[model samples]
Target chain A: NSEVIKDLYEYLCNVRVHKSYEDDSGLWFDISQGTYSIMDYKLGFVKGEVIYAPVLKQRSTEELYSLQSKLPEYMFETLSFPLSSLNQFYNKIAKSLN
Target chain B: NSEVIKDLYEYLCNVRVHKSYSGLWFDISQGTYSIMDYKLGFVEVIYAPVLKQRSTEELYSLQSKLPEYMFETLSFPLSSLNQFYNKIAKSLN
Candidate 1:
């Protein structure tokens, strides 16, 4: 129901710690399971590409200053996490807050 | 070559027949052949979805709306055509 939306919003804003750490650094989560599952948590915003997975607890970062770089523009700091990890994080924060 | 770009510009401007006939009407052409071919020429500005092919001389008009109809709200009367047909129209007109 629409209540889920409210709960999700509360979890994101009140529980999650979203902040810019550096010119291209941050923290995020990744979710695992299912084709529709969230895959990874991105940490930095830079000129590069990477993939993440929460269940596997893995982070894959690709160097941008290379011929293999797909996008040319540099990016700001970013944090990504899998959907499962996101759900878990939300639950933990919500529980602690209550 | 870069010269082709200049020739294309000249052909589009000097040869294309771009005009508004009625409140929201116009004409266009379509190109056929490869995926890179040209297609369709519209004659008016209306809300409809259509596909045109120049080589086939076919025009597939959907009941939907033109892709750029939103431009009309701003007092712009324009027709729609595939990029190829658009290029050809610009060249032919």
Candidate 2:
């Protein structure tokens, strides 16, 4: 999933380069009214934005396992990837343009 | 939004009426292995169970998110609770 975020950042940069939207300075995202909600943006599957250094804002699930069991740990390992903690690290990358 | 979680968690307990479910514990319950709206029951259930375990500082941390998450500084937990509950209440059928 971190790969998804990396790919997206690169894409955002490309879009800015190609588009002629003059006010395209900052890279903020309006996640709800905008696109990118498929990855279950709920469980912190944050498909963030690259707000133009201005109005910055924004930013999954599943499986059933005993909270007391090792299953949750396993699932978190699989789905969370380099996250579940550092995700906050990477996720803040966008919103921290301030 | 966060306050919404608190109120719902509270209401959730209250809903477990004295006039009850034959032997069950809650008016509504979602056990392990079930999926829920991450923001709705999901966020609340995940956090509410542990809210009591939180210390003053920890709860203050949760409360603090109100302003930050709501994009403020002195985040109060009640208004957002009302903000969310009021909006969703109409849709409850």
- Compare the candidates by lDDT and give the number of the best one: 1
Q: List model 2's recovered fraction of native interface contacts, to 2 decimals.
A: 0.00
Tens digits of per-residue lDDT for model 1 on B1-93? 323322222222222112323233323222212122211122332322223432333221211222343212222123222232333322322
Error of 1 at A10 (Å): 47
Please provide, for model 1 over A13-74, each residue's C-alpha lDDT reduced to its tens digit, 9 standing for 90 to 100. Answer: 22111222333342222222111122222332232322232222342343222212322122
Q: Which DockQ-derived CAPRI band holds candidate 1?
A: incorrect
Q: Top TM-score: which candidate number?
A: 2
Displacement of residue A20 (Cα, Å) in model 1 is 54
**lDDT agreement of model 2 with the native:** 0.24
C-alpha positional error of residue B58 in candidate 2 after TM-score superposition, expressed in Å: 1.2
Cα deviation in Å at residue A78, candidate 2? 21
